[PDB]
Amino acid sequence: NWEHLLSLKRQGDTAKRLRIEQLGFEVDYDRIIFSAPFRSLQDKTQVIPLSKTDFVHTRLTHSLEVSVVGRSLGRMVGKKLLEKYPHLEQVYGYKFNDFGAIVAAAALAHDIGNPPFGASGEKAIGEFFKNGYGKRYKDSLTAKEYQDLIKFEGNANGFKVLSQSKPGAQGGLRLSYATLGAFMKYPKESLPHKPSDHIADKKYGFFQSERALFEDVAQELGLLKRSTTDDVSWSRHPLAYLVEAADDICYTIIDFEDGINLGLIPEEYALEYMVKLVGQTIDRNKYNALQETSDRVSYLRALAIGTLINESVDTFMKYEEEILAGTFDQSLIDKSNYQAQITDIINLSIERIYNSREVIEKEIAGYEILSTLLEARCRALDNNDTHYNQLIQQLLAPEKSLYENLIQICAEVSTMTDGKALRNYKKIKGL
Amino acid sequence: NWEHLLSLKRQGDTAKRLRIEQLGFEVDYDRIIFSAPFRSLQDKTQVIPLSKTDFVHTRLTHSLEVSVVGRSLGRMVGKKLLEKYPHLEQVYGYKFNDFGAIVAAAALAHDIGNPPFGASGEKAIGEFFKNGYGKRYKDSLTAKEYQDLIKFEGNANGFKVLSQSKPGAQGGLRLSYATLGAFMKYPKESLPHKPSDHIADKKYGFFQSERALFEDVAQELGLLKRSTTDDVSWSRHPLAYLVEAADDICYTIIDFEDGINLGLIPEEYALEYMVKLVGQTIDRNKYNALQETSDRVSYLRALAIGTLINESVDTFMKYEEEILAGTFDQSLIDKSNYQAQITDIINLSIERIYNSREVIEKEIAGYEILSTLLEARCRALDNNDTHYNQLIQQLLAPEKSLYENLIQICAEVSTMTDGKALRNYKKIKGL
Ligand SMILES: Nc1nc2c(ncn2[C@H]2C[C@H](O)[C@@H](COP(=O)(O)OP(=O)(O)OP(=O)(O)O)O2)c(=O)[nH]1
Ligand SMILES: Nc1nc2c(ncn2[C@H]2C[C@H](O)[C@@H](COP(=O)(O)OP(=O)(O)OP(=O)(O)O)O2)c(=O)[nH]1
Ligand SMILES: [Mg+2]
Ligand SMILES: [Mg+2]
Ligand SMILES: [Mg+2]
Ligand SMILES: [Mg+2]
Ligand SMILES: [Mg+2]
Ligand SMILES: [Mg+2]
Numbered sequence: 001n002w003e004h005l006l007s008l009k010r011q012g013d014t015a016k017r018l019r020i021e022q023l024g025f026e027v028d029y030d031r032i033i034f035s036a037p038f039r040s041l042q043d044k045t046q047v048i049p050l051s052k053t054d055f056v057h058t059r060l061t062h063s064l065e066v067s068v069v070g071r072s073l074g075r076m077v078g079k080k081l082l083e084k085y086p087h088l089e090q091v092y093g094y095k096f097n098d099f100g101a102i103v104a105a106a107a108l109a110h111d112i113g114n115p116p117f118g119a120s121g122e123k124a125i126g127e128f129f130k131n132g133y134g135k136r137y138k139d140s141l142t143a144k145e146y147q148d149l150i151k152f153e154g155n156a157n158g159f160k161v162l163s164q165s166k167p168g169a170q171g172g173l174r175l176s177y178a179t180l181g182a183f184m185k186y187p188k189e190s191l192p193h194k195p196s197d198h199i200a201d202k203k204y205g206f207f208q209s210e211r212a213l214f215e216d217v218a219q220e221l222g223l224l225k226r227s228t229t230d231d232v233s234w235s236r237h238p239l240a241y242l243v244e245a246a247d248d249i250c251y252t253i254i255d256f257e258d259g260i261n262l263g264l265i266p267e268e269y270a271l272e273y274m275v276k277l278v279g280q281t282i283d284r285n286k287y288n289a290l291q292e293t294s295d296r297v298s299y300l301r302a303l304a305i306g307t308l309i310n311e312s313v314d315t316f317m318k319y320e321e322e323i324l325a326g327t328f329d330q331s332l333i334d335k336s337n338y339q340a341q342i343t344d345i346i347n348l349s350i351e352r353i354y355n356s357r358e359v360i361e362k363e364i365a366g367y368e369i370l371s372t373l374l375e376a377r378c379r380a381l382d383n384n385d386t387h388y389n390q391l392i393q394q395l396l397a398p399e400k401s402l403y404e405n406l407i408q409i410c411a412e413v414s415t416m417t418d419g420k421a422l423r424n425y426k427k428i429k430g431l
Numbered sequence: 432n433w434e435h436l437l438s439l440k441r442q443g444d445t446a447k448r449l450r451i452e453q454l455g456f457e458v459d460y461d462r463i464i465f466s467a468p469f470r471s472l473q474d475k476t477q478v479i480p481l482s483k484t485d486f487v488h489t490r491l492t493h494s495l496e497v498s499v500v501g502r503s504l505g506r507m508v509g510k511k512l513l514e515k516y517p518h519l520e521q522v523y524g525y526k527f528n529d530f531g532a533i534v535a536a537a538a539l540a541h542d543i544g545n546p547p548f549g550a551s552g553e554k555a556i557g558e559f560f561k562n563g564y565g566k567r568y569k570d571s572l573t574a575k576e577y578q579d580l581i582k583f584e585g586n587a588n589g590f591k592v593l594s595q596s597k598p599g600a601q602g603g604l605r606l607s608y609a610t611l612g613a614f615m616k617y618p619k620e621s622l623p624h625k626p627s628d629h630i631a632d633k634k635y636g637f638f639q640s641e642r643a644l645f646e647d648v649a650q651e652l653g654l655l656k657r658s659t660t661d662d663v664s665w666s667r668h669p670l671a672y673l674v675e676a677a678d679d680i681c682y683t684i685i686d687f688e689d690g691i692n693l694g695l696i697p698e699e700y701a702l703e704y705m706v707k708l709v710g711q712t713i714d715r716n717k718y719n720a721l722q723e724t725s726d727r728v729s730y731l732r733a734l735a736i737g738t739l740i741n742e743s744v745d746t747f748m749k750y751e752e753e754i755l756a757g758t759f760d761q762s763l764i765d766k767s768n769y770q771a772q773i774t775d776i777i778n779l780s781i782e783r784i785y786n787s788r789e790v791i792e793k794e795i796a797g798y799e800i801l802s803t804l805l806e807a808r809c810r811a812l813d814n815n816d817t818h819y820n821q822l823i824q825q826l827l828a829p830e831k832s833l834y835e836n837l838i839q840i841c842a843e844v845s846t847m848t849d850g851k852a853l854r855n856y857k858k859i860k861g862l
Contacts, residue, residue: 386562387554388798395791430796430853431862 002085003092004222005237006102007178011163011171019093025101028175032109035173037161041111043417045118047255047353049362050418056258059111062250067108069309070246074103076313077242084320099239105175106182106243113158115414116421117366124370125152125410133375137406145403147190148207149410155186156207157414160407163213181221181237185244187214188233198329200236209407224326235326245312245332253304256345257297259353267293270300273344278303311336369425370413376428377409396424433516434523435653436668437533438609442594442602450524456532459606463540466604468592472542474848476549478686478784480793481849487689490542493681498539500740501677505534507744508673515751530670536606537613537674544589546845547852548797555801556583556841564806568837576834578621579638580841586617587638588845591838594644612652612668616675618645619664629760631667640838655757666757676743676763684735687776688728690784698724701731704775709734742767800856801844807859808840827855 008017008024017024032038041060048056078099081088088094115121128134129149138146148156162180164172186205195201206214215232224235256273259265275282281303290296315332322328333342353359373396380392397412416424439448439455448455463469472491479487509530512519519525546552559565560580569577579587593611595603617636626632637645646663655666687704690696706713712734721727746763753759764773784790804827811823828843847855 386558387551388558388795391791391795391798394786395788395795427792428795428799430799430856 001222002081002088004220005178005181005239006094006098007176007181007220009177009220010174012174023098023101024176025098025105025179028105028173028179029101029108031173031175032105037112037415038109040415040417043419044114044116045121045418046251047118047258048359049117049120049366050422055261057254059114062254063108063111065254066110066246066250067104069250069305070107070243071100071104072309073242073246073313074100074239076309077316080313080317102176102178102182103239103242103246105179106239107246109158109162109179109183110243110247111154111158113156113161113414114154115157115370116416116418117363117370120363120366121370121414122152122154124367125374125413126150127367128371128374132371133378134406137402140402142208142403144189144191145208147193149406151190151193151204152410153203154414155203155205156210157411159184159206159214160210160411163210177217177220178239180217181223182239182243184214185236185240187218187223187236189231191231199331201233207407209404226326236323238320238323241316241323241328241332242312245316248331248333249305249308249312252342252345253301253308255349255353257301259349260297261294264352264356265348267296269348270297273341273348274300274304276341277307277338281307308336308338311338366418369421372425372428373413373421374409377413378406381405381409395427432653433512433519435651436609436612436670437525437529438607438612438651440608440651441605443605454529454532455607456529456536456610459536459604459610460532460539462604462606463536468543468846469540471846471848474850475545475547476552476849477682478549478689479790480548480551480797481853486692488685490545493685494539494542496685497541497677497681498535500681500736501538501674502531502535503740504673504677504744505531505670507740508747511744511748533607533609533613534670534673534677536610537670538677540589540593540610540614541674541678542585542589544587544592544845545585546588546801547847547849548794548801551794551797552801552845553583553585555798556805556844557581558798559802559805563802564809565837568833571833573639573834575620575622576639578624580837582621582624582635583841584634585845586634586636587641588842590615590637590645591641591842594641608648608651609670611648612654613670613674615645616667616671618649618654618667620662622662630762632664638838640835657757667754669751669754672747672754672759672763673743676747679762679764680736680739680743683773683776684732684739686780686784688732690780691728692725695783695787696779698727700779701728704772704779705731705735707772708738708769712738739767739769742769797849800852803856803859804844804852805840808844809837812836812840826858 006019008019008022010017038060041063042058043051044059045051046057046059046062048054051058075096078096081099082094082096115125117124126149129137129146134149137149141149159180162173162175162183166172184205186200186203188201188204189206189208189211190204211232218234221237223237226233226235256265256270260267260270278300282299287296287299290299312332315335316323319328319335333339336342376392377396380389380396383389384393397409400408413421437450439450439453441448469491472494473489474482475490476482477488477490477493479485482489506527509527512530513525513527546556548555557580560568560577565580568580572580590611593604593606593614597603615636617631617634619632619635620637620639620642621635642663649665652668654668657664657666687696687701691698691701709731713730718727718730721730743763746766747754750759750766764770767773807823808827811820811827814820815824828840831839844852
């Protein structure tokens with residue numbers, strides 16, 4: 001039921017907010033814009049670590065583009081939905097801008113829990129507990145708590161950052177429940193690991209300490225259970241599909257364009273792989289009148305994004321009933337007519353950009369930096385009577401369980417930028 | 432008896448030197464001035480490590496100021512003492528300048544055994560043997576020798592530096608016995624640890640290898656025993672109180688002034704905490720005519736130092752008999768009327784200067800530097816057949832017991848400046 005999916009509740013509320021008596025979905029955008037976690041995204045790795053103030057993307061600019069594309073997708077889908085179910089507007093009072101606001105707010109914050117150095121950073125944080133110092137804690141934690149530690153993802157960290165309670169400020173940013181539902185793409189815990197081939201089962205979305213919180217949200221939105229066991233799991237919110245589609249479109253095209261502009265990909269491929277996407281709307285005279293690679297690739301990027309957005313809207317509207325029922329098992333991008341072109345673009349990006357020498361060098365350095373910082377924090381946690389551990393506490397982190405302390409350490413390491421992490425690493429070693 | 436406390440003996444002497452047949456107490460000043468250990472004090476930490484050639488103090492300038500204040504205190508106390516005991520001048524032949532010379536010489540060398548990076552350096556050297564590599568030696572040493580290693584202080588190292596025998600030069604600097612007595616403030620060994628609440632029992636003053644030497648000195652000056660056990664301990668030399676008073680006055684006031692000049696303390700506090708000390712002699716017109724913070728704080732510092740010096744002289748002359756008997760249990764500064772102001776100044780200095788971010792960064796770096804250098808020296812000591820250990824010996828240290836070798840390693844690390852230690856650390860790691 002769509003009347004329960006578009007909820008306006010906030011954490012710690014007793015009177016039900018109504019749409020007629022209102023806007024809630026724009027304050028979420030404003031609150032995310034003005035927060036420190038969002039501001040820390042300006043110097044976090046998207047693909048190339050330590051961007052050197054070049055023209056390449058960071059996490060912040062990527063999130064902004066995903067937000068624009070998400071607003072467009074949400075507006076179109078909301079128009080079609082309001083056409084399909086008239087009573088959503090004539091009784092409850094929902095307009096087609098609310099869907100755009102929800103998807104834009106969710107897409108702006110979709111990537112906020114990521115640590116420095118990107119995917120390699122998450123792998124390093126996991127390997128620290130798996131085959132490093134943190135291994136010593138294995139006997140002192142529940143299997144669900146250990147699987148949280150050794151398979152750390154930014155998806156759970158983002159939910160925690162968004163919904164963190166502190167003395168005097170309950171609920172953290174206190175976003176609406178619809179935004180939280182559209183933000184979550186893996187509504188399950190860390191065990192069991194990969195129970196099936198469903199798209200919503202690749203990873204997990206919340207930690208144990210936050211688990212209870214999500215239950216509340218999942219009760220309010222009327223999500224559909226899938227547990228059939230002692231481990232909880234729910235079905236996806238329908239707008240989470242749109243969030244994922246926007247994320248995928250943006251990074252797939254922009255990575256290719258950035259690699260072309262950097263000199264790692266020849267310009268010819270730009271027309272070898274993209275023409276079928278842009279052939280139906282390209283103006284040949286305008287394309288031929290341009291005189292630099294940047295203009296041509298920008299033109300192609302704009303046309304491709306438009307085409308993919310339209311196709312994604314059509315695909316979503318086709319399989320709406322299955323998504324509402326919970327039986328859909330793929331993403332909207334896998335039901336597309338240009339899957340071969342996307343696959344070729346991704347494979348070329350993997351061969352040329354992800355495995356380039358400079359990228360590998362930066363990832364190797366990031367492994368060492370993260371391991372050193374985590375080991376210092378953990379050793380200061382174990383013994384708190386020495387002078388050195390007091391100094392470490394004063395520099396890095398100015399009544400809890402062991403699991404809560406370890407989660408706090410992981411969270412505090414992941415709020416740093418690449419530059420701050422490198423500077424602290426050099427300071428620890430006195431260089 | 433004061434005739435035995437003002438002794439002119441030197442190490443390796445058989446004919447008793449007499450005051451009538453003389454000056455001995457000034458050659459000590461000259462010999463300390465011209466020695467390499469005194470010259471190494473120019474680049475050693477007082478409060479802020481790696482001073483960056485700023486206006487802040489180092490160990491050398493601090494020692495010079497302590498020497499000036501000590502000369503003043505000694506001159507005043509010697510005048511009053513010669514007034515009290517006439518026979519000290521009419522028979523033996525002691526003038527009021529001898530006390531000033533003794534206190535000045537002792538105060539100039541009071542701080543010569545300190546390692547690089549200050550207090551954090553001593554803590555690092557101790558922690559290396561406590562919870563580091565050096566722990567392996569615990570089973571091979573006597574409990575008194577291990578407590579020397581794990582509670583390393585600069586007070587014992589200074590005595591060793593002053594009285595070190597080498598082939599062709601016995602006695603080291605060969606200072607007079609009165610100067611050595613006034614230099615020592617903790618005449619006891621490293622065990623037992625803190626037997627009481629006496630001021631002279633907080634730490635220890637000599638190592639085991641030097642123990643016999645001090646006994647000789649303690650026999651010549653007629654110090655009073657306090658052992659009542661198998662572990663030796665004596666009472667303090669009376670002029671050691673004056674040395675300690677001068678040290679305390681100087682660092683307490685100058686730390687505050689330096690923090691004000693650096694921008695870490697607001698100027699208002701300068702008059703909130705100091706007025707009662709300077710209110711009885713301050714000229715208001717001169718204070719108001721000045722136009723910079725530096726001039727005002729310098730004026731206040733001068734007035735405060737004068738007031739505290741006078742009060743300390745009065746306090747010493749009040750409790751003279753108890754100090755001579757050995758029953759005095761506090762310092763001269765705790766019997767003062769401005770204890771609350773001193774306590775407030777010290778607490779503000781701890782909150783603002785000792786715990787500032789830059790200071791913590793430098794201390795954290797110093798821990799790593801000292802640990803690396805000590806581990807290299809110890810590993811070269813254990814195995815001496817490898818090529819690498821021969822290289823280490825040639826770079827760092829171009830028939831003894833294990834304890835003597837470990838003490839020598841600790842001494843050789845503590846003669847380095849901060850810059851030399853950092854340069855050697857970088858060279859070891861090839862950066
Ligand atoms: N350097 C580097 N970048 C990578 C690698 N794998 C993926 N990336 C980049 C490509 C994209 O810019 C970005 C994709 O991360 P996102 O968090 O936006 O989504 P992703 O689909 O990777 O995962 P998620 O939805 O969070 O489970 O990461 C890799 O192995 N190395
Ligand atoms: N950075 C830093 N400086 C400190 C700390 N504690 C004391 N200091 C500084 C303040 C003074 O400038 C200086 C005092 O050392 P001294 O060797 O002159 O005498 P202290 O009374 O500390 O000890 P002592 O008579 O040697 O047992 O050390 C600390 O925790 N951090
Ligand atoms: Mg992500
Ligand atoms: Mg994804
Ligand atoms: Mg993204
Ligand atoms: Mg000292
Ligand atoms: Mg002291
Ligand atoms: Mg001193």
